């Protein structure tokens, strides 16, 4: 039944996963989300 619930977590968008290192990532495993010269040049 663990697989049946894991899809629910991935199904929902308003879930943020915290790893051991403390960063915030989405269920899929990707991190959920300047130099002056570079931006204008």
């Amino acid at each position: 039944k663990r697989n049946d619930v894991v899809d629910t977590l991935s199904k929902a968008k308003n879930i943020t996963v915290i790893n051991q290192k403390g960063e915030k990532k989405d269920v899929s495993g990707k991190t959920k989300k300047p130099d002056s010269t570079n931006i204008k040049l």
Binding site: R2, N3, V5, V6, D7, T8, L9, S10, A12, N14, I15, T16, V17, I18, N19, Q20, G22, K24, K25, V27, S28, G29
Partner: protein, 285 residues
């Protein structure tokens, strides 16, 4: 690849309340304003979380069991309060938490002591927090000077916040019934934070609470207390064992604190002790 990442952070390995009044009482004593965002620790199924969401602009739920987070997700899916719930899954003692005005927690007892200070040290802390602790740990927080349970934890927490008992929760109120009784307390963090160094207050509190029912003078008689303190004085001069002995003697004599017991001392008494060492150049930490 949801299983790929969630399995790398969890292995997918609790006493559940069944008394509706305490949950209703907890939310009622929160006195949640409509324009307040609530950090909820230990949402569980969501019985407390749903009630908070009704009266809250936003609710941030933090969970440790991926099982229980989904049941929160399923309970609230396709509901008007779905947009107002954000679930953070994983350890939250390491992560820098967001802004929140109130904290309602069915807190895990293992992280009870870290949690109380994380709120206190949280920048711009919550104005009121309804936390549910065990009798032993809670009674230490509520312990007053001169009482048997008066301790370092009481002295440290009491000066950064005021803690007040709300209700008592019996072990029958949960199943499987825990071996210890439970309680609910309200923590009000002081604004502004009393301007005393966090380290210095701990430093003085610790050396005198090694034996709370023993005289403060004796607490400084230990050889290592002199050595750790002597070097601290060498730090003061950089930017002498007999001298630091004499300096300690004058402070305890002049403040008339050398003959009393840490278990029977108030905030002011330690503050005066904290000063008299600063004047003579001794800084604990």
């Amino acid at each position: 690849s949801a299983e790929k990442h969630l399995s790398s952070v969890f292995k997918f390995n609790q006493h559940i309340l069944k008394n509706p009044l305490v949950a209703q009482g907890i939310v009622d004593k929160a006195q949640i304003r409509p324009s307040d965002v609530v950090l909820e620790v230990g949402p569980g199924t969501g019985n407390l979380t749903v009630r908070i969401l009704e009266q809250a602009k936003n609710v941030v739920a933090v969970e440790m069991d991926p099982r229980m987070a989904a049941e929160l997700t399923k309970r609230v899916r396709g509901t008007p309060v779905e947009k107002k719930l954000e679930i953070m899954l994983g350890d939250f003692m390491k992560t820098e938490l967001p802004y929140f005005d109130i904290c309602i927690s069915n807190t895990p007892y293992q992280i009870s002591s870290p949690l109380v200070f994380k709120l206190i040290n949280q920048p711009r802390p919550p104005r009121v927090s309804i936390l549910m602790f065990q009798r032993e740990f809670a009674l230490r927080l509520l312990a007053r000077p001169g009482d048997s349970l008066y301790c370092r934890l009481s002295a440290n927490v009491q000066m950064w916040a005021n803690v007040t008992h709300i209700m008592k929760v019996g072990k029958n109120n949960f199943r499987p019934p825990p071996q210890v009784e439970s309680s609910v307390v309200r923590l009000e963090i002081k604004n502004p934070r009393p301007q005393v160094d966090y380290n210095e207050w701990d430093g003085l509190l610790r050396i005198v609470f090694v034996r709370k029912n023993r005289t403060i003078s004796a607490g400084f008689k230990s050889t290592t207390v002199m050595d750790i303190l002597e070097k601290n004085y060498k730090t003061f001069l950089a930017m002498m064992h007999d001298v630091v002995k004499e300096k300690i003697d004058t402070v305890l004599k002049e403040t008339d604190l050398g003959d009393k017991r840490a278990g029977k001392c108030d905030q002011n008494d330690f503050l005066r002790l904290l000063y008299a060492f600063h004047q003579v150049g001794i800084h604990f930490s």
